[PDB]
C-alpha cells in the first residue's frame, strides 16, 4: 500500500532500428536496492544573478538499473534498440516512456545493465486523488 | 476602406487552429495563441502608418 | 529553544505553462539533513590587500522535502514557480516568493532535493532583535 | 516572470521562386542558445568630443532552431522569406516580417542558425509600460 | 565601509529622438559579476619617436552592462535614444554622464544588454577627502 | 526511431579527369563524430540598409570528412579526380550531389580526408511526409 | 544451477603482428571476484536537446582482468601483440572477440593483468531459446 | 598552559547600506575545528632555481561561529562588515578589523564558517618575544 | 633576504598640464600578481638580410600596473596628467622615470589602472657589484 | 593486426648542392603522435560561382616532423640542403618524396624537427588490392 | 646519460657600442624549462608553382630565454650592446654565436629577457661523429 517506496512492475518492449521488429513487453527485475530516478521536467534551468533563471530546452531522462533477460541480446541494452519503458511504483504511480534512447552506455558484466534512458517526456499517473 | 482591409489582413486566421489561455503550442502544429495574433496585428497595423492610420 | 530544525514547510506552486496556483501545501522532512540558507544576495571575491569585489548574485535556499502523492513531480524540478516558507523551532522563519528551481537532479518519486533561487529571503528574527 | 527564455517560434516560409506560402508551423530550439535580438534600425558609430554618427542600417535576428523533416533545408539558407515570431517567457513577444537570411552556414541537416534582416522588428512588451 | 569593489545604484534616463518623451530616471542591476567599466580623460594619446605624444581629441567612453527594464522598448538600450546615465560605487565615487549615445548596438538576448556609451565628458564625484 | 541524428551510409564515386575511369560507388565510414555539414542553398546573400539583401550567386558546398579507401589513390581525395557523393541519414534523408569537384583540398594524415566539395546544386530526399 | 553468475572458461590466443605468430588458445583464470565487462553495441550515442540522440560510431570494447601466465611474455597482454578472447559463463553465455588490440596499457606487477581489448565487434551466443 | 583553543570571541558587525554598528557580541564555536591563520600578507611562488616570485596578498581567516539569534544571518554572509578579535588559552589575542566575507556558504540558520580578508592581521603574543 | 623577485615601493607624482598642479610624491599597490615591465634601450632595431640590422630611434617605454588612489581622480591615470614613476624591486634595483606621459588609456574598472607610460629614458640604479 | 595507424620506418637522404655529396638513407624517429602529413595531388582548385571550378597547378606538399641525428649538422634540416624523404606506413602504403626542399623553416631547439617539404609529385604505393 | 635534452651552458659576452667595452663571457640560466631555438640555414626559400623554389638571402636567428645578471644593465639585454652568445647542450652540440644584434625588445619584468638574436651565421660543434 502507500508509504513504500520502491518497484513494482517494470516492462521494456525492444525495437531493432535497423531491421524493424518488437520484442515485448518483458517484465524485469532489479538487480539492487537502488530504485530509478527520474526527471521529468523537460527543461533545465541555470542561476543568473539577482534570482533570475535562464530556461533552456532540454531532455526528459530516466535512470533504469535492471537485470538483463537472457533471451534478450546484450547490446539491445546498450543502444542498439529502441526501448518502451513502462514502470509503476508500490505506491499507484505510474512512469510510461516510449521511444526511448541509451545515450552513454557503459561497461556491463552480463547480469546488471544500468540504462540511461533520454525520451522527450515521460508521463506520470498521479493515483487517485490529485491536486 | 480601413474596415476592409482589416478584414482581408484578418482573413489568414480562418480555420487557423488557436491555443487559448489553458496552455501553449506543442512542435509541429500551425496553430497559434492570442498574444501572437495580437503581435502580429500590431505589426500590421503599425506599417500602415501614413496610409489609413495616423502616427499613434 | 536550543533546538535545530524546520517545524513547518510551506510550498506553493505556481505553473508556467497554464497559471494554476497551488497550496499553500505542508512538506515533511525526507531525512536528517536540515533545509539550508543563504541570504546575502551578493557574492564576494577575494582581491589583492583586503579589497573585495562585490558582485550581484542571488540568494539560493537549498530544501529537501518528501513530494506529495497529489502533485506531479514535475512541479518539483523547474516545470513551475515555488512559494516557499520555512519556520525553525527556535521562532525563526524563512520566507521566499517568485523562486525557480537551477539545477533538477534525479530522484526516485520520493524524495526531492530543491536547489531554490530567489532576489530575495525574508528572516523573521524571533522576539529580541540588535 | 524571471524566467528568461523562449516559449514559442513560429516561422513561416515563402518560396522566392514559386510564390507558395508554408506555416506558420512552430519550431523547437536546438541547444541552450536563445535567439539574440537587435531593434534598433540605426548603426552608430563613435566620433570626437562626444559626438556620434547615425548611419541607416538593418534589424537583425539570429535564431538558432531545430529544422523541420517536412520542409526543405534550402528554406532555412535563403531560398525563401521567413516570417519569425517568437514569444518569451515574460510575454515579450517579437515579431518579424518579411524576413531574408543574409550568411547561411554550413549546416549539419538538423539544427541550422539563422541569420534574419528585417526593416523593422516590432515589441509587444507585456502590460505595464514606460 | 570602503575596501569593497562594486556599483550600489545605476540611474539611467533615456529621451527618444524622434518622439523626445523623458523617461526615468530609472534603476537598474547588474547582469553579471562584471563591473561597469569607464574612462574619464577625454584625450586619446599616441606614442611618437624619443618620448614624444600626440595628443588627439577623443571622448569619455563608459562600458556599462544592465539588465533591461520590462518597462522600456529594449530598441532604447541599443542606440534608439539618449541616455543620461549616473552610476554610484560602494566606496562613494559618483560618475554623472549626461548626452551619452550608444555606438556599437551588439545584439542582445533580451535580458541583458551591454552599452557602449560615449559622451563628451564624464565627472568623476572622488569621496571626500582629495589631492 | 526516427529520433536519431547520424549518417548511416556514404557512397562516393571516383570519375578520372583524364582517362575518364569510373570506380565506385565504393561505401565510406566516418573517421569521428563529426557529422557532414551542407549548404543546398546555391545563392549567397549580403546584409544591405533597411531590409534589403543582395542576392549574389554561389555554390551548393558541403564538406565530408570521410576516412579514406586504401584500393583508391590518396590523390582521389585532394582534386585530381570527380567525386559523386550520396549521404543517408538515419532518418531517411539522403543528400545526392554529382560531377563535385574538391575546391580546397588539406594536408591529411593518408587515413582521414576532409573534403570540401562544391557542386551546382544537391537534392533532398526528405522521408514521406513533405510541406 | 541456472541462477549463477560468472565466467566458466576464458581463453586468449595470442598473434605476435610482425612475425605472425599464433600462441593459443590457452585458459586463463580470474585473479579475483571482478567478473570481465562487455560493450556490444558498435554505435555510441549522445544526449542532444528534446528526445534527439547523435549516433557516431565507436568500438566494441572488452575490460578482462586475467591471471597472467608464465609462458606468455608479458609484452603480449600490454599491447605488443594481438589477442583473441572468447569468455563463457556459468548460465551458457559464450563472448567471442577476434582481432582485438589492448589499447590503454595499465602497469602490472607480473601476476595480475587488466586490459582493455577494442574490436570491430563482439558475437553473443545467447543459449537457447531466444527473442 | 598547554591547552590549544579559544576563551572568547568577539564579533563587531556594521551594516554596508544602514551604516548601523553592532557589537562586540561575544560567540560560541559550533564543533571541535578551531579557526585557521594566515599573518604573512605576501604570498611566496616557486621559481627556478630557490628563487620566489613575492606578490601582494590578503591576511585571511577561517571562523566557525554559532549564529546568534539577535543579528540577521545576512550579516553573517557578507552584507556587513566585521571587526572579529578571538583570544586563545595561551594568551594569544588575534585581532583584525574592517574585515569582509568573501565566499559565502549556505547555511543552516545556526552554524556558520566565515572566510574573513583583511589588510593585516595583529597578534598579541603572550608575554615573552623573540 | 635577497633572491626575491617582486616590487616593494612605487612613487607616483602626477603634474597636471591644464592647472599645472602637482600632486605626490603618492605610494601606491599592485592590484594584482602581475609585475611591472620594463624597456631601457632607447634605440629599436630591426632586421635586415644577412646580419646586418637597421637601428631607428624609439621610447623607453613602460607598463605598470596600479591600484588607484581614492584621493587622485581617476583621469590622472588616463592621459590628463603627466607622471614620475619610480619603482623599487626587491633586489635593490630601483628604476627612475620622469616626464612620462600615459599613451594608450585603457577602460578601467575604478580600482585597478594599467598605465603604459613613455619616457625619452629609464634610469637603472643596479644594485651594488656593478660591470 | 592489418588495422594500425601509423609510421614503420622514415628514410631521409641528404644532397648537399654546393658541393653535390649525398648522406644516408638514414633512419628517423618520430618526436611524438604527430604523424607525417601529405598531400599528393598536383592541382590546386578555386571555388567559383555555380559549380564552376578554375584549376591551376600547384605543388605537392608534405609536413614531416621528426628528430634530428646528431651525426648530421641541424642546417641540412632546414632548407640548406635537398632532402630525399621515403616513409613508409603499418597499412603497408609508402610515401617516396624526390628532389624535395624545404620551404618555410622554423626555428627549432635542437631535437625535433618539422619539415614542410615541398616537391612536384609524390608516389603512393597502394598496398595489394587497387582501384 | 647520453639519452638528455637540456642546457649545460649559456655565455654571454656584452660589448657596448659606444665606449667598446667588452664585458664577459658570463654564464647565464635558464628562467624555465623552454630551450634556446635555432634557425642555422643561411637562406630562406619561398615556395612556387610545381616543385620550383626561390632562395633568397635571409639571416641565422635565435631564441634565448635567460635570466638577467644582476651585474649587467638590463639596457644590454636589449638591443643596446652587443651580444656574443655561446651555448652548449647535454649531448655535446655547442652552438656559437659572434657580433649577434637584439632585432625586437620586449617587455621584460627585471627579472628573465628573450633575446632575439640575428647573425650572419651560426656555428655547430656537432659532437664527434658526423656525416
New interface residues.
Given amino acids: 500500500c502507500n508509504k513504500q517506496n520502491g518497484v513494482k512492475n517494470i516492462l521494456i518492449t525492444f525495437t531493432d532500428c535497423d531491421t524493424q521488429e518488437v520484442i515485448g513487453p518483458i517484465s524485469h527485475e532489479q538487480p539492487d536496492d537502488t530504485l530509478p530516478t527520474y526527471k521529468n521536467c523537460a527543461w533545465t534551468n541555470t542561476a543568473l544573478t539577482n534570482g533570475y533563471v535562464q530556461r533552456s530546452a532540454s531532455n526528459a531522462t530516466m535512470t533504469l538499473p535492471v537485470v538483463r533477460d537472457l533471451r534478450v541480446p546484450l547490446a539491445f541494452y546498450q543502444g542498439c534498440a529502441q526501448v518502451d519503458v513502462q514502470v509503476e511504483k508500490f505506491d499507484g504511480t505510474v512512469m510510461t516512456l516510449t521511444e526511448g534512447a541509451v545515450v552513454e552506455p557503459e561497461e556491463s558484466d552480463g547480469r546488471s545493465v544500468t540504462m540511461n534512458i533520454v525520451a522527450s517526456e515521460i508521463d506520470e499517473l498521479l493515483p487517485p486523488g490529485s491536486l | 476602406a480601413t474596415g476592409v482591409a482589416l478584414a482581408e489582413f484578418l482573413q489568414q486566421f480562418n480555420g487557423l487552429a488557436v491555443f487559448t489561455?489553458?496552455?501553449?503550442?506543442?512542435?509541429?502544429?500551425?496553430?497559434?495563441?492570442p498574444?501572437?495574433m495580437?503581435?502580429?496585428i500590431?505589426?500590421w497595423a503599425?506599417?500602415n502608418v501614413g496610409t489609413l492610420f495616423s502616427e499613434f
Avoid at chain 2, 489561455?21 to 495563441?33: A, F, Q, V, W
Fill in positions: 489561455k489553458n496552455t501553449n503550442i506543442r512542435t509541429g502544429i500551425i496553430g497559434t495563441n498574444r501572437l495580437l503581435g502580429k500590431r505589426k503599425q506599417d
